[PDB]
């Protein structure tokens, strides 16, 4: 197991201290400082790796405790960052994100209030170092964790999060299934400095012993509350998989590939009844605004092959995603929308155009997209092309794809390969959008390259030990 | 050493037979047939792998001999595919390419005559299976070979070409330096079914014992003729590195990174004299049209960092590339133009716009471009993004980049990784351009995926054994 120091030679973990004016709380916003030679100034980069060498049985420091306690004592009807933003309040979370992004706190407040950025930050996830997702900010990367072929210990489970974030993952989704979902998710949350998302229909399905037909709103509702209480920061909910959209998939090549979308479709077809998450959307909003769980409105009809890209079914769901987004905003619930999928490069622009218009610029969250189907074993590359392109056009969060996509479960090498490919795509998108100061990273490395400061070049890279070993 | 059968289980090498009407010569155009299950028709793909299990000491069959002999007996003032095309003649080479691309022979003739496509096919490379490079055809991939840290045997040298083409390389460049350049290039040419390019200034530099100041037109001229006699199909010549463009690089971050560009710049600065390849362009054309060597007009001022992308120096050279292209066409010499380099995604469109206009749609040949500098060790990915994008916009030949770029020499794993990444980029570009029948490949694999025909899925992929091993 490599340490932070072994993964990033010449780097130190640092914190920028700022004071939240309104409360007097002192925030310590993390960054990584790369120490350089030859009189070059040290280079400061973003850091999601979190506190190091913390005993998993104890869990991370509850850094947000005093923030949450103060807001509870003041009293408030809703607990979401959007609610606070619309009241004109700059929270600790907003100031923390502003500092982390090197932007103005008012700008962060504005973006959150208008629904164009979200800060996934359940009040029960006290261990979280706040981060922001939105087109006006750095492009972010999500990594998924789940069941290992063999049951994991607590150290092994937590290491999945520590490993993905070491390489740059900005959020995690815990997609675990099986008999120990609650317990392992507790281990993850108490030991995660990054936001943690889930797809709650997975656990609800397990509560009814794998029988989709026995799902209903009530067991879904109970599952949502259970997960919110633990601290889950966002829920993927496929509320746009409407009964009347299911037949639109009949002429597809790969059908419905989304697991959550498949579950909802099966239930809807069994009873010829409308999607129960859609029907109970308002009730879901009531849950979310007591905790601040952000809603990641799923795309259950995402295309699973190039043939199916941008079809009638996909865009029918996108339209409903927009409706659900505006409805959530009425109750001050933070929203992002999930997107494709497999999409060839010439069809990527249409995806962004329609999402920006139909969903009122809510942040977009894509899986890739994969730009070709021909290379299983290399879908981190086929999708990095798509992710970089759709990111350049405004996509705010990129769900990673590993070389094992379509084939099997990812090992640690696979996870690292996936995160690195996605950090490349995300930064290439930052450059393409001319995001402030993004090119400074490239310039520092290229300067080291020109001047034969090899150690500096390696230290500045996304994966220093690979560069160093390849050179040696 | 894996065989063709081990690299591509369920595939066979086949040939499509067509008759060249004018001569009566029978052509056998190669393809790979993937045999599928469940009543699916076999899927036919492009194949550059060439004849298998041929003794390197004997060399490949001289398949073009009767074509070249007949044209010599008829008599002709020039020997280039462009000259023949402008005379209204459809050659064996044109018919072979048309068959290989599933397009009309007249269309191929038209594209070559107008300078919008080239068929690199030196009359002395009799072993060559003809292929075409141009925006209207499949996007092609070049792989580079050169010196191993330790001197190679003939089998070892030839294996570099056999390996790169097995994975899909469409052309090779032999970039060897040192004391045995002529001999090893002979081994390569007599054993290569794909076009082979060189950068002749490298060998000319070796003839003057590594002293750039002792280069001149005369030793360059001798080097060109030597290489043309062996069968080299195209020459990279940096004739656009003009004396007055050198100072335009003074404010760059990484300066002149092209090795050939650096050599010419050093010579020009030493004497304050104009580039001797530029000055003797007409004389170079006289050489090329007796053999049909295509000219790949170099970009010696290509940008070597994101900071330097699309600068005044780069575009000054591009303008001259256009002048040299039109001049070559006057003498019926086939031309492509070389391009960047390191270019961030938002600057890619300008590159294609200017090249298409200033160089009269001559085929473009890029190295990537790399879309970010931050990930040495992964520049096959940073550049695959750029290559796919610039390919989608019309770039005809993509020079590959391996994970060892900027770091060291590529081993066989590195070469394979590079070729696969570039076949992905090239095919993603084919899809983006809506190239006829390109999506059929994706559709076949995705159909196998939907139907759980695992072996078929693997057999249809770019790298079947990786997919199969990852699944198992
Ligand atoms: Co998929
Ligand atoms: Co470079």
Swiss-Prot record, chains A, B:
Keyword terms: 4Fe-4S, Chloroplast, Iron, Iron-sulfur, Lyase, Metal-binding, Plastid, S-adenosyl-L-methionine, Thiamine biosynthesis, Transit peptide, Zinc
Listed GO MF terms: 4 iron, 4 sulfur cluster binding; carbon-carbon lyase activity; iron-sulfur cluster binding; metal ion binding; protein domain specific binding
Cellular compartment(s): Plastid, Chloroplast stroma
Major site of localization recorded for this protein: plastid
Listed GO CC annotations: chloroplast; chloroplast stroma; plastid
Cofactor requirement: [4Fe-4S] cluster
Name of the top EC class for this enzyme: lyase
Disruption outcome: Albino (white leaves) and lethal under normal culture conditions, probably due to an impairment in thiamine biosynthesis.
BP GO annotations: response to vitamin B1; thiamine biosynthetic process; thiamine diphosphate biosynthetic process
Induction, as annotated: Circadian-regulation. Down-regulated by extrinsic thiamine, via a vitamin B1 derivative thiamine pyrophosphate (TPP)-sensing riboswitch regulation. Detected in both dark and light grown seedlings; increased progressively after transfer of etiolated seedlings to light. Up-regulated by salt, osmotic stress and abscisic acid.
Positions of Zn(2+) binding: 342, 406
EC number(s) from the headed UniProt entry: 4.1.99.17
Tissue expression from the record: Strongly expressed in cotyledons, leaves, flowers and siliques, and, to a lower extent, in roots. Expressed in all green tissues, but not in roots, seeds, and petals.
Recorded catalytic activity of this chain's protein: 5-amino-1-(5-phospho-beta-D-ribosyl)imidazole + S-adenosyl-L-methionine = 4-amino-2-methyl-5-(phosphooxymethyl)pyrimidine + CO + 5'-deoxyadenosine + formate + L-methionine + 3 H(+)
Subunit structure: Homodimer.
Function: Catalyzes the synthesis of the hydroxymethylpyrimidine phosphate (HMP-P) moiety of thiamine from aminoimidazole ribotide (AIR) in a radical S-adenosyl-L-methionine (SAM)-dependent reaction.
Family: Belongs to the ThiC family.
Protein name: Phosphomethylpyrimidine synthase, chloroplastic
Native organism: Arabidopsis thaliana (Mouse-ear cress)
Full protein stretch here: 85 to 556 of 644
């Amino acid at each position: 197991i490599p340490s932070f120091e072994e993964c990033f030679p010449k780097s130190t973990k640092e914190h920028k201290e700022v004071v939240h004016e309104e409360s007097g709380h002192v925030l310590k916003v993390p960054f990584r400082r790369v120490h350089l030679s030859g009189g070059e100034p040290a280079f400061d980069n973003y850091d999601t790796s979190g506190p190091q060498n913390v005993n998993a049985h104890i869990g991370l420091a509850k850094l947000r405790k005093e923030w949450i306690d103060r807001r509870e004592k003041l009293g408030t009807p809703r607990y979401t960052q959007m609610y606070y933003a619309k009241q004109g309040i700059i929270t600790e979370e907003m100031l923390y994100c502003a500092t982390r992004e090197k932007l103005d706190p008012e700008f962060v407040r504005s973006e959150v209030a208008r629904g164009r950025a979200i800060i996934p930050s359940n009040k029960k996830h006290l261990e979280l170092e706040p981060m922001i997702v939105g087109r006006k900010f750095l492009v972010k990367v999500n990594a998924n964790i789940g069941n290992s072929a063999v049951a994991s210990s607590i150290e092994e489970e937590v290491y999945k999060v520590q490993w993905a974030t070491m390489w740059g993952a900005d959020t995690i989704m815990d997609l675990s299934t099986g008999r120990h979902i609650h317990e392992t998710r507790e281990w993850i949350l108490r030991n995660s400095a990054v936001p943690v998302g889930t797809v709650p229909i997975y656990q609800a399905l397990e509560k009814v012993d794998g029988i989709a037909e026995n799902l209903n709103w009530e067991v879904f509702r109970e599952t949502l509350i259970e997960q919110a209480e633990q601290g889950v920061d966002y829920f993927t909910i496929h509320a746009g998989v409407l009964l009347r959209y299911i037949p639109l998939t009949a002429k597809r090549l790969t059908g419905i590939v989304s697991r959550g979308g498949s579950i909802h479709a099966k239930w809807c077809l069994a009873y010829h009844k409308e999607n129960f998450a859609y029907e109970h959307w308002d009730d879901i909003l009531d849950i979310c605004n007591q905790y601040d769980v952000a809603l990641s409105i799923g795309d259950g009809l995402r295309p699973g092959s190039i043939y199916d890209a941008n079809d009638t079914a996909q865009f029918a769901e996108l339209l409903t995603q927009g409706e659900l987004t505006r409805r959530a905003w009425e109750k001050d619930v933070q929203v992002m929308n999930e997107g494709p999928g497999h999409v060839p490069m010439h069809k990527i622009p249409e995806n962004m155009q329609k999402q920006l218009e139909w969903c009122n610029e809510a942040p977009f969250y894509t899986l890739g997209p994969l730009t070709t189907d021909i290379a299983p074993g290399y879908d981190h590359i086929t999708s990095a092309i798509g992710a970089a392109n759709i990111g350049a056009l405004g996509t705010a969060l990129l769900c990673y794809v590993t070389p094992k996509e379509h084939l099997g479960l990812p090992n640690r090498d696979d996870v690292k390969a996936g995160v690195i490919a996605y950090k490349i795509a995300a930064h290439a998108a930052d450059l393409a959008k001319q995001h402030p100061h993004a090119q400074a990273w490239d310039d520092a490395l290229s300067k080291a390259r020109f001047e034969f400061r090899w150690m500096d070049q390696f230290a500045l890279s996304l994966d220093p030990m690979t560069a160093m070993s390849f050179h040696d």
